[PDB]
Amino acid sequence: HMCDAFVGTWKLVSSENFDDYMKEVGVGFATRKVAGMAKPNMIISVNGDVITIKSESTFKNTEISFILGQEFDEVTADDRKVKSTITLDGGVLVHVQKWDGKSTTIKRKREDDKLVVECVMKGVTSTRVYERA
Ligand SMILES: Oc1nc(S)nnc1Cc1ccc2c(c1)OCO2
Structure with a gap:
């Protein structure tokens, strides 16, 4: 029951300062622009000791x-x-x-x-907030 409250399907609902985080990491212009537009779904699951x-x-x-x-x-x-x-x-x-x-x-x-x-x-x-999908 390791990580139970994380398990599920999540959708991005807000982001702050992600462009500046990506700049600090070294991400180049075109990747920053396309990556910054994305609204990912994050899917978290657990099987035994393995988290995906x-x-x-x-x-x-x-x-x-x-x-x-x-x-x-x-x-x-x-x-x-x-x-x-x-x-x-x-x-x-x-x-x-x-x-x-x-x-x-x-x-x-x-x-x-x-x-x-x-x-x-x-x-x-950068702070990125997800809600249940
Ligand atoms: O869009 C994302 N949102 C969350 S929370 N995690 N990973 C991603 C995917 C991602 C895109 C660009 C990035 C990055 C990660 O690290 C530096 O540049």
């Missing part, structure tokens, strides 16, 4: 499966090749991506009927 997070949008479809605390390789929607580790910290999924000597952290939490995603690169935060 899918993102489906008109920009890119992605899928990661992982065990908490166990590093994995991830190709992000913006085409970075990163090494990722996801843990649970006080009920928050904390996802750290490392590449090219850089690091970004993505936190996913349940707040009321929302799933809130906070993306941080250095001093820049």
Whole structure:
């Protein structure tokens, strides 16, 4: 019942500062414009110890499966090749991506009927709010 309250199908309903987050990560102009338009659905499921997070949008479809605390390789929607580790910290999924000597952290939490995603690169935060689909 690890992650029960995250499981389901979620749709993006608001975003703030995502362009600035993407700039801080190193995303180029054209990818930022097309990625910033997307309204992804996030689909989260759990089978035993394996958590799967899918993102489906008109920009890119992605899928990661992982065990908490166990590093994995991830190709992000913006085409970075990163090494990722996801843990649970006080009920928050904390996802750290490392590449090219850089690091970004993505936190996913349940707040009321929302799933809130906070993306941080250095001093820049983007907040992306999802509701049940
Ligand atoms: O649109 C998205 N929304 C959520 S919450 N997560 N991933 C995505 C997909 C995505 C697009 C562009 C990006 C990125 C990730 O990282 C830097 O540039």
